Structures are given as structure tokens and as C-alpha cells.
Design an enzyme around this catalytic site. Structure first.
Site, PDB file in Angstrom:
ATOM      1  N   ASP A  34       0.835  -1.183   0.000  1.00 33.08           N
ATOM      2  CA  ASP A  34       0.000   0.000   0.000  1.00 33.08           C
ATOM      3  C   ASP A  34       0.888   1.258   0.000  1.00 33.08           C
ATOM      4  O   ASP A  34       1.373   1.647   1.049  1.00 33.08           O
ATOM      5  CB  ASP A  34      -0.836  -0.025   1.251  1.00 33.08           C
ATOM      6  CG  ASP A  34      -1.821   1.110   1.407  1.00 33.08           C
ATOM      7  OD1 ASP A  34      -2.012   1.799   0.391  1.00 33.08           O
ATOM      8  OD2 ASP A  34      -2.351   1.286   2.529  1.00 33.08           O
ATOM      9  N   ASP A 219      -2.036   5.939  -4.864  1.00 29.05           N
ATOM     10  CA  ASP A 219      -2.475   5.090  -3.750  1.00 29.05           C
ATOM     11  C   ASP A 219      -2.794   3.689  -4.269  1.00 29.05           C
ATOM     12  O   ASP A 219      -3.902   3.457  -4.749  1.00 29.05           O
ATOM     13  CB  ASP A 219      -3.669   5.661  -3.023  1.00 29.05           C
ATOM     14  CG  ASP A 219      -4.076   4.925  -1.740  1.00 29.05           C
ATOM     15  OD1 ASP A 219      -3.512   3.847  -1.516  1.00 29.05           O
ATOM     16  OD2 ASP A 219      -4.907   5.464  -1.013  1.00 29.05           O
TER      17      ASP A 219
HETATM   18  C1  LIG Z   1     -12.865  -2.607  -5.298  1.00 27.72           C
HETATM   19  C2  LIG Z   1     -12.986  -2.018  -3.896  1.00 27.72           C
HETATM   20  C3  LIG Z   1     -11.753  -2.325  -3.005  1.00 27.72           C
HETATM   21  N1  LIG Z   1     -11.687  -1.356  -1.909  1.00 27.72           N
HETATM   22  C4  LIG Z   1     -12.493  -1.581  -0.698  1.00 27.72           C
HETATM   23  C5  LIG Z   1     -11.849  -2.717   0.088  1.00 27.72           C
HETATM   24  C6  LIG Z   1     -10.404  -2.610   0.539  1.00 27.72           C
HETATM   25  C7  LIG Z   1      -9.889  -3.809   1.310  1.00 27.72           C
HETATM   26  C8  LIG Z   1      -8.395  -3.861   1.532  1.00 27.72           C
HETATM   27  C9  LIG Z   1      -7.869  -2.822   2.488  1.00 27.72           C
HETATM   28  C10 LIG Z   1      -8.166  -2.870   3.839  1.00 27.72           C
HETATM   29  C11 LIG Z   1      -7.615  -1.950   4.735  1.00 27.72           C
HETATM   30  C12 LIG Z   1      -6.812  -0.891   4.271  1.00 27.72           C
HETATM   31  C13 LIG Z   1      -6.531  -0.780   2.904  1.00 27.72           C
HETATM   32  C14 LIG Z   1      -7.062  -1.738   2.036  1.00 27.72           C
HETATM   33  C15 LIG Z   1      -5.625   0.363   2.395  1.00 27.72           C
HETATM   34  C16 LIG Z   1      -6.320   1.693   2.348  1.00 27.72           C
HETATM   35  C17 LIG Z   1      -5.369   2.845   1.922  1.00 27.72           C
HETATM   36  O1  LIG Z   1      -4.283   2.982   2.827  1.00 27.72           O
HETATM   37  C18 LIG Z   1      -6.106   4.137   1.816  1.00 27.72           C
HETATM   38  N2  LIG Z   1      -5.151   5.290   1.683  1.00 27.72           N
HETATM   39  C19 LIG Z   1      -5.764   6.573   2.095  1.00 27.72           C
HETATM   40  C20 LIG Z   1      -4.769   7.691   1.748  1.00 27.72           C
HETATM   41  C21 LIG Z   1      -7.068   6.871   1.341  1.00 27.72           C
HETATM   42  C22 LIG Z   1      -5.963   6.560   3.617  1.00 27.72           C
HETATM   43  C23 LIG Z   1      -7.227   6.600   4.201  1.00 27.72           C
HETATM   44  C24 LIG Z   1      -7.347   6.495   5.586  1.00 27.72           C
HETATM   45  C25 LIG Z   1      -6.235   6.312   6.387  1.00 27.72           C
HETATM   46  C26 LIG Z   1      -4.987   6.298   5.822  1.00 27.72           C
HETATM   47  O2  LIG Z   1      -3.917   6.146   6.660  1.00 27.72           O
HETATM   48  C27 LIG Z   1      -2.639   6.687   6.273  1.00 27.72           C
HETATM   49  C28 LIG Z   1      -4.857   6.373   4.429  1.00 27.72           C
HETATM   50  N3  LIG Z   1      -7.482   1.632   1.453  1.00 27.72           N
HETATM   51  C29 LIG Z   1      -8.678   2.142   1.743  1.00 27.72           C
HETATM   52  O3  LIG Z   1      -8.867   2.823   2.736  1.00 27.72           O
HETATM   53  C30 LIG Z   1      -9.801   1.974   0.747  1.00 27.72           C
HETATM   54  C31 LIG Z   1     -10.851   2.887   0.791  1.00 27.72           C
HETATM   55  C32 LIG Z   1     -11.943   2.767  -0.049  1.00 27.72           C
HETATM   56  C33 LIG Z   1     -11.965   1.748  -0.991  1.00 27.72           C
HETATM   57  C34 LIG Z   1     -10.937   0.823  -1.027  1.00 27.72           C
HETATM   58  C35 LIG Z   1      -9.819   0.957  -0.204  1.00 27.72           C
HETATM   59  C36 LIG Z   1     -10.952  -0.233  -2.074  1.00 27.72           C
HETATM   60  O4  LIG Z   1     -10.307   0.003  -3.087  1.00 27.72           O
END
Ligand SMILES: CCCN1CCCCCc2cccc(c2)C[C@@H]([C@H](O)CNC(C)(C)c2cccc(OC)c2)NC(=O)c2cccc(c2)C1=O
Length: 329
Positions: A34, A219
Site C-alpha cells: 500500500d 495510492d
Molecule cells: C474494489 C474495492 C476495493 N476497496 C475496498 C476494500 C479494501 C480492502 C483492503 C484494504 C483494507 C484496509 C486498508 C486498505 C485496504 C488500504 C487503504 C489505503 O491505505 C487508503 N489510503 C488513504 C490515503 C485513502 C488513507 C485513508 C485512511 C487512512 C490512511 O492512513 C494513512 C490512508 N485503502 C482504503 O482505505 C480503501 C478505501 C476505499 C476503498 C478501497 C480501499 C478499495 O479500493
């Protein structure tokens, strides 16, 4: 040894997992890699939820090199996808035959939605290898990637994702297998993310950004691209979902706008076939609102499904950091 591959497996939903070895003797886990976060998380035997019990859980008591952290910290992280909690420790990791000793990581104890059934009940989550910057390092002195480079001094300080059974993280270098044409470089800003300045954004002929300082974040942890919440309706009004099949979607999308990201002299154009996804005979844009800690209101994410599927991305770690973008081969 100095350029090495970490094959990635595409599990549903989206994100893409690789083999990580933790502890002595090594226990195997399949975390997502990530660029949108910094902490290492590993799902452990401390998590007794059904969503944890169903995966391969790391057992720290089976690791001779595991050390519980001195400072007994409970971390809570609210991701856009769900929440995780747990405690902090230290162990030896192995990625792609490279050793990373005395690495701080989070030991998952709990997994939840942000509200019952959550994303973790559907997916097979085993952890996160954060590749972000110290600004979102919650515990410990040094991000994973900086620690690997520190302990592996002949690795060049870069990694690249090639998305789409041929997705792979390449560390220390790049391959012409993965891209076409040139690689253009943007300087990284702030201390948290692979974040670059966004000068302007057009949806077809409409300028929708920018009058304040605005940013793109690369991201790999998110499938979708994003806009700030104020522009949720903007995007939905200008880019409608529409009926499509496998047979006609190219014709249906001929009328759709090019999305242009203007990063100074570099312009990235996302054509309709690069940002619209086909699910249940609906062409829908791969855009949604997602809260970005420390960049509320002015961040636009470029995720895996639209952006990295079409564009090979290189992440050059400052020893100032840079992102490289080229068209995927
Ligand atoms: C097709 C849809 C897939 N999907 C939803 C499921 C994701 C499951 C895997 C998973 C679980 C936990 C964390 C993550 C992945 C990684 C984070 C990523 O780190 C987000 N990065 C940002 C900058 C947006 C962030 C937000 C909040 C806190 C933070 O801390 C530094 C960083 N992914 C997600 O938060 C996320 C959000 C919505 C949709 C999906 C993933 C996604 O694509």
C-alpha cells in the site's frame, strides 16, 4: 539480487497481495502493498474475530525474534474501507529474499466496519505493507521501505508497480517489459504520501480545479480514483453511469469526456475506457469520495484500477522523492 520481484496476486475486490515472511522460523503472510499508508500491519492470533480466524494468523509466540514493543501502544486506524486495531511489536521480515530486522509493525487484534458485516468478512485480509512516509508512521522510528533500503545498501531506492497473473512489485529498478515511451518525474510533497502538486483538472472542456493548492496522491491501496467531497456531485453530474455490454461498451463510451490531470508541463489524460468499469451491464466511473487524513478537501487519489492498470508508476525514494509515470505496455 539487487533488483528483485515481488509477484502480486489479484484477489477480489482489488487490492493485490504478495508473499511476506515474518519471524524466526518464518511464518508466511499475504499482505497488500500500500503506497497510501506507512505502518506495517500483520493479522495475528490476538484477533479472535471470524474474519481473522479464517486466514493464516501470525503467531508471535512461535517467533524466536519477536519482541513486544516496550511502549504498550494500542493503535486504532480508520481506513476508508474499515477499521483495524491492535498492539505494536518488532520482528525480522523477509521480502523477496531480502532481510529487514528489528522492524516495528502493528499486530491486528480487531477488524471492523466504520459504522455488523464488514469488508473483512468478504476478503482474506492478512495485513498491509505500507510504503508511505514517516508522517503516517504511528509507531517506531523508521518506515518499512526505508528500513529495507538501510539494511540492503546495494538496492537502488525505488520500487514500481506493474498492474495486470502478471502483476508484480519490482524493487530496485524497472523493466521495459512493463512500460512504453518515456517516464516523467514529479516531486513529492509533504511527509505522508506519494503526493504531487496538481495544477488543473479538466473533465472534457470543463475546468473543475484548481484555485487552491491541490494534490494528487498515488495510492495502490485503493482501487478507485477520488475527488474531494465538494466535487462529488460535480463528477456525478458530468460523468453519468450508463447501460453497456461487453459487445457495445467501446461505442457507448465514444461520447464520454477525457479527464485531464495537469501537473505543470505534464498532462495525464484518462480516456473513458481507462476510467469507466463494466459491472452488471453498467459502465460506471471508477471514482468515489474517500477521506484522506491530513489532506481533506484538496486531494485527488489515483488508484490501481483506473490509473495503474494503464500507467506504469515508479516511486523514487529520496535518499527529494519523485514519482515517475509512463504508459503501460
Ligand atoms: C474494489 C474495492 C476495493 N476497496 C475496498 C476494500 C479494501 C480492502 C483492503 C484494504 C483494507 C484496509 C486498508 C486498505 C485496504 C488500504 C487503504 C489505503 O491505505 C487508503 N489510503 C488513504 C490515503 C485513502 C488513507 C485513508 C485512511 C487512512 C490512511 O492512513 C494513512 C490512508 N485503502 C482504503 O482505505 C480503501 C478505501 C476505499 C476503498 C478501497 C480501499 C478499495 O479500493
Amino acid at each position: 539480487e539487487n533488483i528483485f520481484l515481488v509477484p502480486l496476486k489479484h484477489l477480489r475486490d482489488s487490492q493485490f497481495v504478495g508473499e511476506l515472511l515474518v519471524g524466526t522460523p518464518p511464518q508466511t503472510v499475504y499482505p497488500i502493498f500500500d503506497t497510501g499508508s506507512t505502518n506495517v500491519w500483520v493479522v495475528t492470533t490476538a484477533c479472535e474475530e471470524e474474519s481473522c480466524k479464517k486466514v493464516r494468523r501470525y503467531d508471535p509466540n512461535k517467533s524466536k525474534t519477536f519482541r513486544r514493543s516496550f511502549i504498550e501502544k494500542n493503535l486504532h486506524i480508520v481506513f476508508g474501507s474499515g477499521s483495524i486495531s491492535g498492539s505494536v511489536g518488532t520482528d525480522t521480515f523477509m521480502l523477496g529474499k531480502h532481510l529487514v530486522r528489528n522492524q516495528t509493525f502493528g499486530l491486528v487484534e480487531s477488524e471492523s466496519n466504520n459504522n455488523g458485516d464488514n469488508i473483512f468478512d468478504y476478503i482474506s485480509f492478512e495485513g498491509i505493507v505500507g510504503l508511505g512516509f514517516p508522517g503516517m508512521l504511528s509507531a517506531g522510528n523508521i518506515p518499512f521501505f526505508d528500513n529495507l533500503l538501510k539494511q540492503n545498501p546495494n538496492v537502488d531506492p525505488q520500487f514500481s508497480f506493474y498492474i495486470s497473473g502478471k502483476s508484480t512489485l519490482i524493487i530496485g529498478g524497472i523493466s521495459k517489459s512493463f512500460y512504453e515511451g518515456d517516464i516523467y518525474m514529479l516531486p513529492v510533497l509533504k511527509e505522508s504520501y506519494w503526493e504531487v502538486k496538481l495544477d488543473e483538472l479538466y473533465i472534457g472542456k470543463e475546468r473543475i480545479c484548481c484555485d487552491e493548492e491541490s494534490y494528487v496522491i498515488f495510492d495502490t491501496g485503493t482501487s478507485y480514483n477520488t475527488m474531494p467531497s465538494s466535487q462529488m456531485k460535480t463528477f456525478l453530474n458530468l460523468i453519468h453511469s450508463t447501460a453497456c455490454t461487453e459487445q457495445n461498451y467501446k461505442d457507448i463510451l465514444k461520447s464520454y469526456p477525457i479527464i485531464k490531470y495537469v501537473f505543470g508541463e505534464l498532462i495525464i489524460e484518462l480516456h473513458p475506457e481507462e476510467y469507466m468499469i463494466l459491472n452488471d451491464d453498467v459502465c460506471m466511473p471508477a471514482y468515489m469520495q474517500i477521506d484522506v487524513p491530513s489532506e481533506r478537501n484538496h486531494a485527488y487519489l489515483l488508484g490501481s484500477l483506473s490509473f495503474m492498470r494503464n500507467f506504469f508508476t515508479v516511486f523514487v525514494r529520496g535518499t527529494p522523492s519523485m514519482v515517475g509515470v509512463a504508459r503501460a505496455k
